[PDB]
């Protein structure tokens, strides 16, 4: 009939887009959280009644963006720091009074360019290689090395990703929402929750739990080359400690250039390790093995094994505790076979100092030694399994973006398009 | 009731059309460090996308309007739906999909219908 189009400005309609997000937070930490905008104390979460949105955590660009943001903030926090290239010199190393940590003396440059000094420093095994025995730092034949500034903290601080004006983020309130599909209950937020950028391996630490039941996510779970992202609902507590009482020793290697060396151990020489409750880890593996049958069979047997190969970062529960990078053997956590129907586990963890962090080959970092006795307490709230191509699941990881994907599944970035044309029996005058 | 930003996303086109200022407020404010350049790029992007919608409203004679009535008659090729089966049945989300193809055409019709309207008004006042 008499129908003319009419313009409407401000219509609840949006499109899937990807924009540049910005950070918000609440010593300087590597994640420059001091440069982020203050998190608003009144977080507005608007619930979208009747709305049903399609999500796909495996295409999410927030993950790919967060992963390069961390890498970008890591590289930013190492520019002003001292370069340990004069440390790439021949070392004379002896064992310490098995044979893991060494005691290495070298000729080093002083603050005067024509004077040397015969200093000594302790180094873990994993940081040196042979040629008194003659050794050398591991990185020297591959990459330059930069000492982490000893005033920046590796502490995961809750970061919130915010979308610009005219964009929004769509949460997913579905308590049993797996990876993809149409989220029945949806709400819109301006920023994400407090995401801690915990760099970890095999065991997802300090993350966000699952309500109701323990979830399991994967692209193609029938595809063996896709890591299974299992998320716990009850946290199993893990306690880690390096018990040696280490000491830090400054070594002036140039004008304004001080290399912090491991002085000596004050007292007992002991192993670093982690404890988990064997009971709580038994019942948590059971909750996992239950939801593992929903995809593989009520009668097939589910077996857990340790890693089958790779580099130290992926074959071990790699993480950071009070500033020192642990590498824990996990064979004591994934050694169970499950049929159709005080306690403590202890993990031998090694310690390293020359760490390449991500997978960059060219940018190594020396973590300065932490004085005192290191111990930290954290929850393992997730897991990264890998079924063997009896269905056996073994831990694994490496690609750090699965860590970010384990917390960014709930979210999606959409672009608001508020112009809408629709017909009514309306017309303007002359 | 006050549903909130995009609160009426699942409501009918008629219901949501009464809550336009809700979505109109938060389109410009919201509901050399790494973050420094990351934020500046977003502050410029928000202004550009805002002025583009304002630019279209301006050349349609709708500047300042939230509900704007025009002169372009509704071509049934775009959607042969009845009035009562749109404003009381569909959601703006569904509507934007069904008019996806014809949206660029309407945007041109609304433009010349305004340059001819003011060219006519320049003659109405030439006496």
């Amino acid at each position, epitope marked *: 009939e008499n129908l003319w189009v009419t313009v409407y400005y401000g219509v609840p309609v949006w499109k899937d887009a990807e924009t540049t997000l910005f950070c918000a937070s609440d010593k300087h930490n590597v994640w420059a959280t001091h440069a982020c905008v203050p998190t608003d104390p009144n977080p507005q979460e608007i619930h979208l009644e*009747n709305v*049903t*949105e*399609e999500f796909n955590m495996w295409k999410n660009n927030m993950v790919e963006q967060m992963h390069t943001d961390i890498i970008s903030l890591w590289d930013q926090s190492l520019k002003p720091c001292v370069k340990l290239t004069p440390l790439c010199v021949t070392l004379q190393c002896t064992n310490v009074t098995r044979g893991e940590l060494k005691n290495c003396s070298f000729n080093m440059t002083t603050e005067l360019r024509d004077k040397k000094q015969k200093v000594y420093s302790l180094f873990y095994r994993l940081d040196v290689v042979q040629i008194n025995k003659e050794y050398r730092l591991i990185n020297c034949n591959t990459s330059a090395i930069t000492q982490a500034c000893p005033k920046v903290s590796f502490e995961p601080i809750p970061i919130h990703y915010c979308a610009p004006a005219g964009f929004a983020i769509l949460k997913c309130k579905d308590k049993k929402f797996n990876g993809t*599909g*149409p989220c*029945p209950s949806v709400s819109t937020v301006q920023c994400t929750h407090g995401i801690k950028p915990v760099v970890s391996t095999q065991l997802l630490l300090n993350g966000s739990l699952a309500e109701e039941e323990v979830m399991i996510r994967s692209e193609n779970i029938t595809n063996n080359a896709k890591n299974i992202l299992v998320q716990f609902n009850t946290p199993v507590q893990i306690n880690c400690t390096r018990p040696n009482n280490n000491t830090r020793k400054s070594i002036r290697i140039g004008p304004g250039q001080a290399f912090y060396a491991t002085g000596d151990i004050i007292g007992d020489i002991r192993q670093a390790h982690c404890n988990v409750s064997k009971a709580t880890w038994n019942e948590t593996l059971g909750k996992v093995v239950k939801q593992l049958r929903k995809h593989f069979g009520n009668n097939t047997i589910i077996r857990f094994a340790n890693s089958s190969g790779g580099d130290l970062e992926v074959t071990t529960h790699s993480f950071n505790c009070g500033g020192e990078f642990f590498y824990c053997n996990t064979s004591g956590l994934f050694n169970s076979t499950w049929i159709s129907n005080n306690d403590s586990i202890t993990l031998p963890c090694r310690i390293k100092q020359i760490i390449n962090m991500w997978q960059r080959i060219g940018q190594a970092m020396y973590a300065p030694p932490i004085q005192g006795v290191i111990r930290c307490v954290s929850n393992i709230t997730g897991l990264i399994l890998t079924r063997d191509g009896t269905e056996t699941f073994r831990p694994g990881g490496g690609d750090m973006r699965d860590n970010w994907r384990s917390e960014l599944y709930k979210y999606k970035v959409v672009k608001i398009e508020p112009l809408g044309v629709a017909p009514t029996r309306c017309k303007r005058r002359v | 009731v006050f549903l909130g930003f995009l609160g009426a996303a699942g409501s*009918t086109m*008629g*219901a949501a059309s009464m809550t336009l200022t809700v979505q109109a407020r938060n389109l410009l404010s919201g509901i050399l460090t790494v973050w420094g350049i990351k934020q500046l790029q977003a502050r410029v992007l928000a202004v550009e996308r805002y002025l583009r919608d304002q630019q279209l409203l301006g050349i349609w004679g709708c500047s300042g309007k939230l509900i704007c009535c025009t002169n372009v008659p509704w071509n049934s090729s775009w959607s042969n739906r009845n009035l*009562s*089966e749109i404003w*009381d*049945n569909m*959601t703006w*989300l*569904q509507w934007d999909k069904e008019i996806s193809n014809y949206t660029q055409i309407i945007y041109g019709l609304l433009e010349e219908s305004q340059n001819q309207q003011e060219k006519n008004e320049q003659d109405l006042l030439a006496l």
Partner: nanobody, 128 residues
Framework: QGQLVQSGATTTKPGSSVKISCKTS????????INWIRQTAGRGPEWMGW????????????????RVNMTTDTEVPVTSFTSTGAAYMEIRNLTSDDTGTYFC????????????????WGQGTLLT
């Protein structure tokens, strides 16, 4: 704009109860009421009642208030604007007067004055 398939022709005897299904598709189930209407031998057509899958609300004629069990499940979302639902119907004091063809009908609009009007119907079920 979808289908509303129903159960089969389950013929019982007076005194018992009969449960007839109505499985929906091709449309958002929670956005429209589900009307129940019957056309028996002895009268013409008679409107029994509708139920709102979203609000859970139920409104039925006084001629069937103390007989009809009207319940709905919760939709399993297929796409953004598609789901699959299910509507149930029972009758208490069944007799031979209640023998006829029974249907479910999707409501007409989401607002206005004809919200619940039986617009999109099923196929029918033959009772006793």
């Amino acid at each position: 704009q979808g289908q509303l398939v129903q159960s089969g022709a389950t013929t019982t005897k007076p005194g018992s109860s009969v449960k007839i299904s109505c499985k929906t598709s091709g449309y958002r189930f929670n956005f429209y009421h589900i009307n129940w209407i019957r056309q028996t031998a002895g009268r013409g057509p008679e409107w029994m009642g509708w139920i709102s899958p979203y609000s859970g609300d139920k409104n039925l004629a006084p001629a069937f208030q103390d007989r009809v069990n009207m319940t709905t499940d919760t939709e399993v979302p297929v796409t953004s604007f598609t789901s699959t639902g299910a509507a149930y119907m029972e009758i208490r004091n069944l007799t031979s007067d209640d023998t006829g063809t029974y249907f479910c009908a999707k409501g007409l609009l989401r607002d206005g004055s004809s919200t619940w009007l039986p617009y999109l119907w099923g196929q029918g079920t033959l009772l006793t």
